[PDB]
Short mmCIF file of C-alpha atoms and ligand atoms in Angstrom, two decimals:
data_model
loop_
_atom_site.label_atom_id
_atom_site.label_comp_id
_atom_site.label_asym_id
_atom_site.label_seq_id
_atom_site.Cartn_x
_atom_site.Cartn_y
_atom_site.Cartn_z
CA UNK Z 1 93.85 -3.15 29.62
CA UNK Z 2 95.82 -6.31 28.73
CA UNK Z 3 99.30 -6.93 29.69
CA UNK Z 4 102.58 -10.03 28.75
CA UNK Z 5 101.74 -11.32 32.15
CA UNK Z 6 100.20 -14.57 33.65
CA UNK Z 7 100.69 -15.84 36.89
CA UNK Z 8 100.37 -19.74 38.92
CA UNK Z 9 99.09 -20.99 42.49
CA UNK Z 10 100.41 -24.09 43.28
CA UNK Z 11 97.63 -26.11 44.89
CA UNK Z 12 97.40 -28.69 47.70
CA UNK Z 13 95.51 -31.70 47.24
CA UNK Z 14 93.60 -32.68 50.90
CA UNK Z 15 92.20 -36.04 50.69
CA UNK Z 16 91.02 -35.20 46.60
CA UNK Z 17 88.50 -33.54 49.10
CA UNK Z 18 90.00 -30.18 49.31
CA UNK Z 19 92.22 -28.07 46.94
CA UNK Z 20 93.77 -24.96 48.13
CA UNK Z 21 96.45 -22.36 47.43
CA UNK Z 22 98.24 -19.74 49.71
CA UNK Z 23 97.51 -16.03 49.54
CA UNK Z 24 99.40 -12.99 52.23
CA UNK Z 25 97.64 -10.35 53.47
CA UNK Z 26 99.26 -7.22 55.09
CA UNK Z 27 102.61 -5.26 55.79
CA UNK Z 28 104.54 -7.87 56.08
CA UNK Z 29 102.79 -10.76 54.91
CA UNK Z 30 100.01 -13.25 57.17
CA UNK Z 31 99.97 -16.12 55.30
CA UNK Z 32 96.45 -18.17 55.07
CA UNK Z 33 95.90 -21.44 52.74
CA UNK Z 34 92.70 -20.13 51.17
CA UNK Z 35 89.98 -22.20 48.60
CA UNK Z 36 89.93 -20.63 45.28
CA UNK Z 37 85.76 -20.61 44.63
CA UNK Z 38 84.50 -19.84 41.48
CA UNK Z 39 80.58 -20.44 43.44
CA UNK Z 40 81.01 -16.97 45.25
CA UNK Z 41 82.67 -13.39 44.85
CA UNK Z 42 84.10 -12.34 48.53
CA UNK Z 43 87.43 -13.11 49.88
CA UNK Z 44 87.13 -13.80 53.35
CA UNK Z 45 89.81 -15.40 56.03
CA UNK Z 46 89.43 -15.98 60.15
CA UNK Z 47 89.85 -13.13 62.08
CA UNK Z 48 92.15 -12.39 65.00
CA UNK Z 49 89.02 -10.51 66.55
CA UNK Z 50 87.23 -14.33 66.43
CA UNK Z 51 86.10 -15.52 70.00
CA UNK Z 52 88.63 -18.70 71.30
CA UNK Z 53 85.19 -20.00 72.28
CA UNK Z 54 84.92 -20.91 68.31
CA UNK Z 55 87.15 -24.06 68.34
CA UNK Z 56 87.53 -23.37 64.35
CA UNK Z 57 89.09 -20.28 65.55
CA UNK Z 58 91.86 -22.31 67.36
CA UNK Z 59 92.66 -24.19 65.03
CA UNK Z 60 93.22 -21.92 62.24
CA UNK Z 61 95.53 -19.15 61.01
CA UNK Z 62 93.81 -15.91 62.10
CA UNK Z 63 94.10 -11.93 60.51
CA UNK Z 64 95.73 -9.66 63.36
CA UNK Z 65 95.15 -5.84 61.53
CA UNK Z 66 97.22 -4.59 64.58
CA UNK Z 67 100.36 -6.22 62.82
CA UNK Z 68 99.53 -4.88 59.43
CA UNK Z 69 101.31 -1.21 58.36
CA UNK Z 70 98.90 -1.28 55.31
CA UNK Z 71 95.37 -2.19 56.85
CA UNK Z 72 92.74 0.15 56.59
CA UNK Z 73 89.93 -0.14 58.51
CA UNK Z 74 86.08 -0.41 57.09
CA UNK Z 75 84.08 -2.05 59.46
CA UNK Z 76 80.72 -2.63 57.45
CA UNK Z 77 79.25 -5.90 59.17
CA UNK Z 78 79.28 -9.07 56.25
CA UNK Z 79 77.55 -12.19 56.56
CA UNK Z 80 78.15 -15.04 53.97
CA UNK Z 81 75.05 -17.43 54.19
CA UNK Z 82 76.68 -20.93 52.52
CA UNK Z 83 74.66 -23.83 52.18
CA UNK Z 84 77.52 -25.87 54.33
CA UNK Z 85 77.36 -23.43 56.83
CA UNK Z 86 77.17 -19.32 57.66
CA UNK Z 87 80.34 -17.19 57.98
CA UNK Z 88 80.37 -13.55 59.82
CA UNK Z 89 82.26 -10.40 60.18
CA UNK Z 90 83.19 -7.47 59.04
CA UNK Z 91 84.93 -5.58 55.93
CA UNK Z 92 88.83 -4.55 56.15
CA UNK Z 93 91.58 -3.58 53.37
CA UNK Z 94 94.68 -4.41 53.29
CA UNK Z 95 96.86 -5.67 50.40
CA UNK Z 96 96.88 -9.42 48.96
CA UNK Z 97 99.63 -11.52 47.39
CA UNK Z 98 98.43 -14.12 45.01
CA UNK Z 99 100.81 -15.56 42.72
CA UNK Z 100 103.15 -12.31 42.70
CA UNK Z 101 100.50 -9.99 41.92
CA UNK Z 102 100.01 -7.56 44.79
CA UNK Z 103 96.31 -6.12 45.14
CA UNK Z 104 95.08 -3.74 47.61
CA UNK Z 105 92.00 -5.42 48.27
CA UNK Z 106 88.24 -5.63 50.26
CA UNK Z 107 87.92 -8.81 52.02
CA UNK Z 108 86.12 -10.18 55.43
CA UNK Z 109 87.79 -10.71 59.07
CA UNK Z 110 85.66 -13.74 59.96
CA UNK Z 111 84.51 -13.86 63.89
CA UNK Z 112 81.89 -16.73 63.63
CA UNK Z 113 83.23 -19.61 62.09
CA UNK Z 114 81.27 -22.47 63.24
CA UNK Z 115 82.88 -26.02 64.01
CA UNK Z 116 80.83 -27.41 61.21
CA UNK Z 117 82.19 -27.70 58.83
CA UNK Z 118 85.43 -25.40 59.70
CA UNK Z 119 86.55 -28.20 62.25
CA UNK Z 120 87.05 -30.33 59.05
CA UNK Z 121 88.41 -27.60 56.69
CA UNK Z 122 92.31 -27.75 56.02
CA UNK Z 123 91.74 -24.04 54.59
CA UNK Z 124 91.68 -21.14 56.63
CA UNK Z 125 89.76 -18.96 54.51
CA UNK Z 126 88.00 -18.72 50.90
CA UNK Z 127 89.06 -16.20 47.72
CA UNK Z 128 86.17 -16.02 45.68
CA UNK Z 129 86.44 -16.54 41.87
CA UNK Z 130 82.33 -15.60 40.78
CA UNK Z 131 81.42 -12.00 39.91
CA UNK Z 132 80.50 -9.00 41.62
CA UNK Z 133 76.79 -9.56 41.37
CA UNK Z 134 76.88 -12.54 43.50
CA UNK Z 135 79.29 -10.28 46.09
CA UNK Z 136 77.81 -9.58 49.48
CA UNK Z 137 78.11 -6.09 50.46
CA UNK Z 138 78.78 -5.35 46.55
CA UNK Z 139 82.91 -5.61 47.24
CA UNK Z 140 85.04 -5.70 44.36
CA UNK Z 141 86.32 -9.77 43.60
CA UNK Z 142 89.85 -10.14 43.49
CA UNK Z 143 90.33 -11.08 39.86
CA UNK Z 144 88.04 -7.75 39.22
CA UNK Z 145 90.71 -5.73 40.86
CA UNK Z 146 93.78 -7.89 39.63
CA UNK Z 147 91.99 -6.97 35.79
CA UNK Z 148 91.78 -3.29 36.52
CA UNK Z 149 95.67 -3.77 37.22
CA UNK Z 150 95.80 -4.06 33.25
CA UNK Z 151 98.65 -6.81 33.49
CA UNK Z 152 97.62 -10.34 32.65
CA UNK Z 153 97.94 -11.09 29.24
CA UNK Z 154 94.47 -12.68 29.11
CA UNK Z 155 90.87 -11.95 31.19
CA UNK Z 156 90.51 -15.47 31.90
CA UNK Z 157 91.85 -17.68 34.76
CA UNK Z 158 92.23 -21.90 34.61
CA UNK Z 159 91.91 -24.91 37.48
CA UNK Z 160 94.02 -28.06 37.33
CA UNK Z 161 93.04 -30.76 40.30
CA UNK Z 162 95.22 -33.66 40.76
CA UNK Z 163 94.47 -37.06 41.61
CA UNK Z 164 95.79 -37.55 45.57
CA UNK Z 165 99.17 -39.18 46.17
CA UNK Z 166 106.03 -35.66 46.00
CA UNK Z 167 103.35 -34.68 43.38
CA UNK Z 168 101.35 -31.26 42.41
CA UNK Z 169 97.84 -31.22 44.06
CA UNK Z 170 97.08 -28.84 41.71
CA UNK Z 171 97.33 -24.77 39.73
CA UNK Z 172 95.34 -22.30 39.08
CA UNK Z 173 96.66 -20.06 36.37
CA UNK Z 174 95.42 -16.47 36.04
CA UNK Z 175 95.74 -14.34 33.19
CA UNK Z 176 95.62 -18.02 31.02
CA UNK Z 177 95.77 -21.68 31.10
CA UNK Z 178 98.64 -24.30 31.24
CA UNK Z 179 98.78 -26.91 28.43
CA UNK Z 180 101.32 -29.07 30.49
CA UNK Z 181 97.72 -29.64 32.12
CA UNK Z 182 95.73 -30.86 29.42
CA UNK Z 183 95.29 -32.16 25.89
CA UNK Z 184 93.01 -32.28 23.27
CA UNK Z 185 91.16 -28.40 22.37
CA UNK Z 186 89.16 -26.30 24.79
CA UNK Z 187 85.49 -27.25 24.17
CA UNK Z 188 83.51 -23.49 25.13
CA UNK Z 189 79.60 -23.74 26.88
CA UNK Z 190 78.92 -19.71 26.94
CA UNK Z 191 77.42 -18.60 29.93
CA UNK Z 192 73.35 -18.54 30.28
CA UNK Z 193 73.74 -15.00 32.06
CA UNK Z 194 77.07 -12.82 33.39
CA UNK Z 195 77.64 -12.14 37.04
CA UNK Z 196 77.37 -16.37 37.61
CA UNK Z 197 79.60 -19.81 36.34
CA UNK Z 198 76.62 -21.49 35.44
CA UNK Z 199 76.05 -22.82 31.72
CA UNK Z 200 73.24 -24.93 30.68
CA UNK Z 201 73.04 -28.89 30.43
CA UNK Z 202 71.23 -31.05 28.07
CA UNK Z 203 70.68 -34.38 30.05
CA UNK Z 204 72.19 -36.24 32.42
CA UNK Z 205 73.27 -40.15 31.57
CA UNK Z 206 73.15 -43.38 34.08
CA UNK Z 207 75.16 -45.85 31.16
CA UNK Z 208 73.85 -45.49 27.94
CA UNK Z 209 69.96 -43.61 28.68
CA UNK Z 210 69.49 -39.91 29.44
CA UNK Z 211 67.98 -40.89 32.93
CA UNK Z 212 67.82 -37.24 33.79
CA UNK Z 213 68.17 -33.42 32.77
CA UNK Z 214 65.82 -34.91 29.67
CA UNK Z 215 64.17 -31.47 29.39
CA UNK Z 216 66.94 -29.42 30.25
CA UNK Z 217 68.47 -28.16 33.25
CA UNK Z 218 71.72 -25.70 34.52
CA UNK Z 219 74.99 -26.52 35.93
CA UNK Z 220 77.27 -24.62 38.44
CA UNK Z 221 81.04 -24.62 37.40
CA UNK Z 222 82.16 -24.27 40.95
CA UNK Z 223 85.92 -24.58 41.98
CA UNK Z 224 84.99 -24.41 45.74
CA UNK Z 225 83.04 -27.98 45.83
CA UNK Z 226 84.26 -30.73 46.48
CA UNK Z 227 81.50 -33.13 44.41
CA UNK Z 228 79.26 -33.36 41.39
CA UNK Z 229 76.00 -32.37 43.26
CA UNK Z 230 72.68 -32.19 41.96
CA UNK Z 231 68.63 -31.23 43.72
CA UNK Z 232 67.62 -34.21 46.72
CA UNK Z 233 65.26 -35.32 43.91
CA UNK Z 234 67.81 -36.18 41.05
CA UNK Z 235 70.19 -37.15 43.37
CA UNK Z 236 67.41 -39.96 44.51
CA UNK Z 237 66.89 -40.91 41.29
CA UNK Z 238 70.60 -41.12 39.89
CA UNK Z 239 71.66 -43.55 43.48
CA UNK Z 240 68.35 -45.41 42.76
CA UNK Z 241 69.66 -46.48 39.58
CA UNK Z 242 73.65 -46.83 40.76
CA UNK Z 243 72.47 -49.16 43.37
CA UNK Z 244 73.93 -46.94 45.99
CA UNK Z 245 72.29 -46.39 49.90
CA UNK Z 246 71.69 -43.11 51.38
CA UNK Z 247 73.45 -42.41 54.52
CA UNK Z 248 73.57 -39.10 56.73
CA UNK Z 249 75.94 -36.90 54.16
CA UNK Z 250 76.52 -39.11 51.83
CA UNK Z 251 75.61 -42.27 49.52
CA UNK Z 252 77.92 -45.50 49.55
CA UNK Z 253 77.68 -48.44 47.78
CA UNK Z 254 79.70 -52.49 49.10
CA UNK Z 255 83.13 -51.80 48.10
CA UNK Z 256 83.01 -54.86 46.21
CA UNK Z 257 80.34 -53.30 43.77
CA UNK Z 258 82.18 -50.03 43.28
CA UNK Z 259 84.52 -51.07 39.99
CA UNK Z 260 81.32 -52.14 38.63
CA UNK Z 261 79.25 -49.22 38.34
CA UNK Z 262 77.96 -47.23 35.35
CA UNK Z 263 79.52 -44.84 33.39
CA UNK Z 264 77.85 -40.81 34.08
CA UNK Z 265 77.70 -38.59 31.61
CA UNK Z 266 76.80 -35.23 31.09
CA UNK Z 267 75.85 -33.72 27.97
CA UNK Z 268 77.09 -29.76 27.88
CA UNK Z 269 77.30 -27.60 24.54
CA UNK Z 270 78.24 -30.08 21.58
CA UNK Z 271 80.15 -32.26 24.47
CA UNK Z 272 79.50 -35.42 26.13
CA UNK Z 273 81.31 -35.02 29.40
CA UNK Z 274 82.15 -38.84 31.06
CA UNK Z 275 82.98 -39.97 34.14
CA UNK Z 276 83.38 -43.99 35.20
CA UNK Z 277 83.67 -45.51 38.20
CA UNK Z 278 87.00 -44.49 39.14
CA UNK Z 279 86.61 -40.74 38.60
CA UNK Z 280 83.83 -40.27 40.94
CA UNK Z 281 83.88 -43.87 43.87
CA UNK Z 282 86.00 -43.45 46.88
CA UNK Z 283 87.92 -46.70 46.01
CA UNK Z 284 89.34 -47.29 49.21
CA UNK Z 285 89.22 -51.57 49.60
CA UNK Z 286 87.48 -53.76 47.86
CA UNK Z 287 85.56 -55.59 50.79
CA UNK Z 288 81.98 -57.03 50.46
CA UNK Z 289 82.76 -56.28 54.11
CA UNK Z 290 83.12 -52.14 53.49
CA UNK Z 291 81.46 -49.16 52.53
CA UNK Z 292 82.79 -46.94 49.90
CA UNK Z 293 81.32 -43.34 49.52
CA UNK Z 294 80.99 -41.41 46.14
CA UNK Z 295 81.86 -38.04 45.15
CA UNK Z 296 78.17 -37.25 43.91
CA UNK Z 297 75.71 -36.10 47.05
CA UNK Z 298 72.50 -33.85 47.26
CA UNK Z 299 72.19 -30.45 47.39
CA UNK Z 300 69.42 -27.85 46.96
CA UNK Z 301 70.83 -24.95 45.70
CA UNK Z 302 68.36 -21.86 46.16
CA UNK Z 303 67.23 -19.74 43.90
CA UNK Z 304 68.27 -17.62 41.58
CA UNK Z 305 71.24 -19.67 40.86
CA UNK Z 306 69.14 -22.73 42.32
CA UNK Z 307 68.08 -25.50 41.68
CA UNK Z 308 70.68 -26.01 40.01
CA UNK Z 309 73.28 -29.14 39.70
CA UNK Z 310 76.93 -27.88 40.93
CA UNK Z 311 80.06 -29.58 38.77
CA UNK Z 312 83.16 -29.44 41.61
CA UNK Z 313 86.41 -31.36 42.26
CA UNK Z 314 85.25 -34.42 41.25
CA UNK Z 315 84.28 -33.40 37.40
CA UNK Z 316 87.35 -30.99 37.10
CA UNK Z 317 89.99 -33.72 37.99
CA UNK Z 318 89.15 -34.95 34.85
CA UNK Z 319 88.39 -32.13 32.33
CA UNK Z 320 90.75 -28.91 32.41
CA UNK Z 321 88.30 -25.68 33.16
CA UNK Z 322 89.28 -22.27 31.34
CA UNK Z 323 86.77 -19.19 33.31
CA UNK Z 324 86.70 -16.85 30.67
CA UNK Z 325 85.96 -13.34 31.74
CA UNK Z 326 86.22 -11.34 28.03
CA UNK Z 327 84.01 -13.59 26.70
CA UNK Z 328 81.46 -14.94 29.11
CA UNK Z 329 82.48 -18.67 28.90
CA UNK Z 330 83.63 -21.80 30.18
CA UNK Z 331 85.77 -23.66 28.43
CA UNK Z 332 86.58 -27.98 29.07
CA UNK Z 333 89.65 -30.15 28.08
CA UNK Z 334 91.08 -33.25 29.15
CA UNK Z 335 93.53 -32.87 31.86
CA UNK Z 336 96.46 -34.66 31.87
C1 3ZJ T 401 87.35 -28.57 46.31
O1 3ZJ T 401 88.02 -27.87 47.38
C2 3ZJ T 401 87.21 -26.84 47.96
C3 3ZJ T 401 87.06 -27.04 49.49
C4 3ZJ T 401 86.05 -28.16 49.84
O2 3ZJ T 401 85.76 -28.22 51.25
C5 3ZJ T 401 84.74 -27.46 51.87
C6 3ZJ T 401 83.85 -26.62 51.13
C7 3ZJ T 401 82.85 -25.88 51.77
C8 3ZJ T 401 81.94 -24.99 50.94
O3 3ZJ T 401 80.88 -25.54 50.65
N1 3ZJ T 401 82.28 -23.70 50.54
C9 3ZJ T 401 81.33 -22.84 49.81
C10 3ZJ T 401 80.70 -23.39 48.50
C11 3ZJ T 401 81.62 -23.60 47.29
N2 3ZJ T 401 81.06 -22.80 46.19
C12 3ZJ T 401 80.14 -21.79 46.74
C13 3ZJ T 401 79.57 -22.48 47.98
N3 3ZJ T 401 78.39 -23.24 47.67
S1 3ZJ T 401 77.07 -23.17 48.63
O4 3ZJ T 401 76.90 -21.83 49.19
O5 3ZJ T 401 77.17 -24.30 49.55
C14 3ZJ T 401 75.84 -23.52 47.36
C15 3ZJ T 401 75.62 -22.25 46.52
C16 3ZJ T 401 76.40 -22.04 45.37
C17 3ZJ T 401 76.19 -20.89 44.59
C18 3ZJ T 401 75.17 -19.97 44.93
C19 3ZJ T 401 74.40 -20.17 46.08
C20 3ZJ T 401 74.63 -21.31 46.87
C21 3ZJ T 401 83.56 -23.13 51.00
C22 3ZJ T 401 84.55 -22.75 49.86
C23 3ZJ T 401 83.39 -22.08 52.13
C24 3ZJ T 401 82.72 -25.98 53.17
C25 3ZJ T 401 83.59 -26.78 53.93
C26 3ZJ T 401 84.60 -27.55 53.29
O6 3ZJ T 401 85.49 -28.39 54.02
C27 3ZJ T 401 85.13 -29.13 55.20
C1 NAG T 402 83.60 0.71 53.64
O1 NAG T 402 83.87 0.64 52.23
C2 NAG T 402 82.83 1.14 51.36
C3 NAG T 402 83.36 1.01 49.95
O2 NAG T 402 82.49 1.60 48.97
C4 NAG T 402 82.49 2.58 51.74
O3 NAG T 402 81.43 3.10 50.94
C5 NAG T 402 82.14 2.65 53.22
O4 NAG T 402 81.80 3.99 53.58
C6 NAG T 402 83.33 2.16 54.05
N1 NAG T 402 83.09 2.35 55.47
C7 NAG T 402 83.98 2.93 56.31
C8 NAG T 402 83.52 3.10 57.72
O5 NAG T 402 85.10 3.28 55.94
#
């Protein structure tokens, strides 16, 4: 069912690192500041249950059930294995506020949340914007439920990312996109298969030359990162030729020799998608003196969705993405 109605998150920009919105769960309202993630399905925020022994735990806004008239209980144990780091808990219902809409929804009360990387996360918790095939425990995703609701005037949802600054950090639209946000047409990749954001890419450039993804290769349209990553091998070969040094978690190149750099491009559909210099070097002096870090770093994603390069902040601050749910499709424009 299709309804007149679309609705906006207002996003906050941390650091052009982090990007999240605010969500309320419960009778009356616990507000979290939650990471709208296209690269997984379950909604999940810290739990009130959660050890003080986790110092993440301390340091973030927890879910007390016992202050909820609308909770219902569940129970089922959940663990969400990320690649950053592990989350557990268990399942509870209760009902969500996301940009007006009220949904009674499934989601995780988080009692391990280690101190890496939650120490570092401005979020408190994660709403996940991928299907219910990648959902642990098989739980309904939000936008699933919010669809069933028969409301929005569109099945598709868009992400606008702000460069850092009084500004807008950022919006997520649901139910359509924004064109105060971009320009230019919508360029549509369809997906390779449902249940994931992952289209397929024809090469990867490093200036002019298709360096890499030569015969082929799949990218991960995922809200929820904060870089352009790609496997510990292509990675290795793209810094190689950027002139860049590997650190401990990340690459950085002499300040000085950041404005200099190559532009990268990605070829996806019947679209060459660029970035220069500026759009994905941590410009932060321009010392001979200093190191300046990228936002491009390795990461082996496992299968099935793996290996598989992962397109996050970085490449949607500059291109406009449309997640097209009726149709199976991603959609690209530039944002303005
Ligand atoms: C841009 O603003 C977003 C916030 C940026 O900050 C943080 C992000 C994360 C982070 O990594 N998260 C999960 C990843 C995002 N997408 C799915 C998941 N990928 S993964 O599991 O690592 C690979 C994979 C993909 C798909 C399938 C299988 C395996 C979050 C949302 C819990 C952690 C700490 C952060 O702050 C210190
Ligand atoms: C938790 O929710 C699922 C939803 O399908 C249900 O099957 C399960 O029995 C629930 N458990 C409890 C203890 O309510």
């Amino acid at each position: 069912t299709l309804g007149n109605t679309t609705s906006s998150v207002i996003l906050t920009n941390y650091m052009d690192t982090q990007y999240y919105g605010e969500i309320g769960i419960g009778t009356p309202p616990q507000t979290f500041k939650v990471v709208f993630d296209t690269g997984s399905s379950n909604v999940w925020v810290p739990s009130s249950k959660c050890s003080r022994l986790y110092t993440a735990c301390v340091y973030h806004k927890l879910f007390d059930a016992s202050d909820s008239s609308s909770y219902k209980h569940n129970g089922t144990e959940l663990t969400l294995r990320y690649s950053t780091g592990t989350v557990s808990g268990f399942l509870s219902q209760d009902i969500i506020t996301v940009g007006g809409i009220t949904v009674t929804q499934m989601f995780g009360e988080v009692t391990e949340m280690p101190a890496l990387p939650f120490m570092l996360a401005e979020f408190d918790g994660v709403v996940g914007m991928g299907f219910i095939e990648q959902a642990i425990g098989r739980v309904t995703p939000i936008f699933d439920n919010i669809i069933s609701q028969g409301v929005l005037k569109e099945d598709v949802f868009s992400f606008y990312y702000n460069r850092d600054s009084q500004s807008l950090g950022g919006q997520i639209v649901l139910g359509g996109s924004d064109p105060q946000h971009y320009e230019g047409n919508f360029h549509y990749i369809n997906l390779i298969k449902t249940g994931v954001w992952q289209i397929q890419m024809k090469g990867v450039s490093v200036g002019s030359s298709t360096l890499l993804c030569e015969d082929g290769c799949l990218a991960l349209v995922d809200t929820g990162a904060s870089y352009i990553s790609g496997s510990t091998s292509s990675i290795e070969k793209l810094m190689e030729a950027l002139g860049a040094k590997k650190r401990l978690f990340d690459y950085v190149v002499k300040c000085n020799e950041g404005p200099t750099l190559p532009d990268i491009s990605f070829h996806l559909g019947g679209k060459e998608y660029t970035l220069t210099s500026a759009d994905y070097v941590f410009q932060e002096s321009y010392s001979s003196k200093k190191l300046c870090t990228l936002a491009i770093h390795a990461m082996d994603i496992p299968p099935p969705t793996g290996p598989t390069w992962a397109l996050g902040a970085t490449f949607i601050r500059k291109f406009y993405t449309e997640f097209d749910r009726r149709n199976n499709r991603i959609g690209f424009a530039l944002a303005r």
